[PDB]
Amino acid sequence: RKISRIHLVSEPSITHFLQVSWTLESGFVITLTDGHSAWTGTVSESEISQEADDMAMEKGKYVGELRKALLSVYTFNFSKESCYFFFEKNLKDVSFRLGSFNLEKVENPAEVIRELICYCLDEIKSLKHEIKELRKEKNDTLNNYDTLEEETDDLKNRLQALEK
Amino acid sequence: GERKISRIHLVSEPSITHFLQVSWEKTLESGFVITLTDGHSAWTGTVSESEISQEADDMAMEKGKYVGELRKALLSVYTFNFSKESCYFFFEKNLKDVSFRLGSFNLEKVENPAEVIRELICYCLDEIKSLKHEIKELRKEKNDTLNNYDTLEEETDDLKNRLQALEK
């Protein structure tokens, strides 16, 4: 998955969180939350095909914009009454949409929020663990390079002393 | 300031994960803020420097030991208790066959839970980004040295071949 902070136009004051889980080409789940409510939509490959056909765009580029847009200067839109989500690719004060998706309001949003925070805390734990091994490996590699430099200097010294 | 976010389970709500966020401006011993949240509501309490010393005294515990226990329990066997009707949070130390209360706190139901939850998530997302940056730099520094190693080793081997031939 990827969790991105976004601002909606209808609510520029606060930060929303866009959680996308999936390659995206084979349909995905998109979740929006403001820390209280949550909206979730499962986008099928069928629904994807119908969006790229309604706007006459290449699959690869379309998914590429999805990939470039959903995982993170794009703008994001969501109406809490119609529950339709869409984003635009902006360029030169000119913009166009990449389809819309329906995000149904979730009955028990606290479950989603809890899961999102747990995911982040688990990720932090995993990254710290990885860093501990990488620190040691980095230090070992620097030490081994120093050893080789000293070993190589010894060889050159022996060659030059040999010459004379 | 600094903070620590911990996952806990409550005796009275064993199924749901709660999050305990403890933060301090200077140091834990000089005052901290303790927030409990289930991802929907949040309760917060401020603990002053003098309240810590008074709690240690009421417990007939040496202040350093009391603070040491707060660190082990609130920053992360300890049990956590909270009731959404009393807004009263206490945790206990459980040794073999016996437990005892390690101080308690009265939390106040926050008025803006969503704001607190968003700020907490943002903190985690910022930490993930910083940790990913750190990993990327560590791995590049390691890989850069390995490349220099392999380059230097080409010369080392040639010098060995030259020296072996000359000393042969």
UniProtKB/Swiss-Prot annotation, chain A:
It is found in: Nucleus; Chromosome. This is DNA repair protein XRCC4. Changing residue 2 to E: Abolished interaction with NHEJ1/XLF. Widely expressed. It is linked to Short stature, microcephaly, and endocrine dysfunction: A disease characterized by short stature and microcephaly apparent at birth, progressive postnatal growth failure, and endocrine dysfunction. In affected adults endocrine features include hypergonadotropic hypogonadism, multinodular goiter, and diabetes mellitus. Variable features observed in some patients are progressive ataxia, and lymphopenia or borderline leukopenia. Belongs to the XRCC4-XLF family. XRCC4 subfamily. Changing residue 68 to E: Abolished interaction with NHEJ1/XLF. Abolished ability to bridge DNA. Changing residue 39 to R: In SSMED; impairs the protein function in DNA double-strand break repair. The chain holds residues 3 to 132 of 336 of the full protein. The lineage of its organism: Eukaryota, Metazoa, Chordata, Craniata, Vertebrata. Phosphorylations by PRKDC at the C-terminus of XRCC4 and NHEJ1/XLF are highly redundant and regulate ability of the XRCC4-NHEJ1/XLF subcomplex to bridge DNA. Phosphorylation by PRKDC does not prevent interaction with NHEJ1/XLF but disrupts ability to bridge DNA and promotes detachment from DNA. Monoubiquitinated. Changing residue 61 to E: Strongly decreased interaction with NHEJ1/XLF. Abolished interaction with NHEJ1/XLF. Abolished ability to bridge DNA. Abolished interaction with NHEJ1/XLF. The modification Phosphoserine is found at residue 49. It comes from the Eukaryota. The gene is XRCC4.
